[PDB]
Amino acid sequence: RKLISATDIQYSGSLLNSLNEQRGHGLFCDVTVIVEDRKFRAHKNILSASSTYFHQLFSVAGQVVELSFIRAEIFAEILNYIYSSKIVRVRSDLLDELIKSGQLLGVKFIAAL
């Protein structure tokens, strides 16, 4: 007779922090993204969910992907967003580059800054 519903407002945040902690260790990371002279380990499921570019890319098999036209430190910030919902203390002189990286990768919130 009785139907029960409940919503955990803390969940999606805790989950993202845990996913970011994993990423720091490379745990469960199933792709490496090479950007200039840097390699970033990440999770395909998260990248696919959050980037229209990666969503397209990860329909093809492959464990290493290479990005052109984005500087490593800018990609580092895009990934920090993907793994947190936030951009934190970005120099204003980098913002145009960050926006452009969001545009290229199809990360809507970043492209809209």
Curated annotation (Swiss-Prot):
Domain (BTB): give its ranges.
29-91
Q: Where is this region: Interaction with NCOR1?
A: 1-100
Q: Which tissues does it occur in?
A: Expressed in vascular endothelium.
Induction: what does the entry report? Induced in vascular endothelium by wounding. This effect is potentiated by prior laminar shear stress, which enhances wound closure.
| Localization, UniProt | Nucleus; Cytoplasm
Ranges for the region named Self-association are 1-113
Q: How does it assemble?
A: Self-associates. Interacts with CTNND2. Interacts with CTNND1, and this interaction inhibits binding to both methylated and non-methylated DNA. Interacts with NCOR1. Interacts with KPNA2/RCH1, which may mediate nuclear import of this protein. Interacts with CBFA2T3.
Q: What does this protein do?
A: Transcriptional regulator with bimodal DNA-binding specificity. Binds to methylated CpG dinucleotides in the consensus sequence 5'-CGCG-3' and also binds to the non-methylated consensus sequence 5'-CTGCNA-3' also known as the consensus kaiso binding site (KBS). Recruits the N-CoR repressor complex to promote histone deacetylation and the formation of repressive chromatin structures in target gene promoters. May contribute to the repression of target genes of the Wnt signaling pathway. May also activate transcription of a subset of target genes by the recruitment of CTNND2.
Q: What is this protein called?
A: Transcriptional regulator Kaiso
Q: Which organism is it from?
A: Homo sapiens
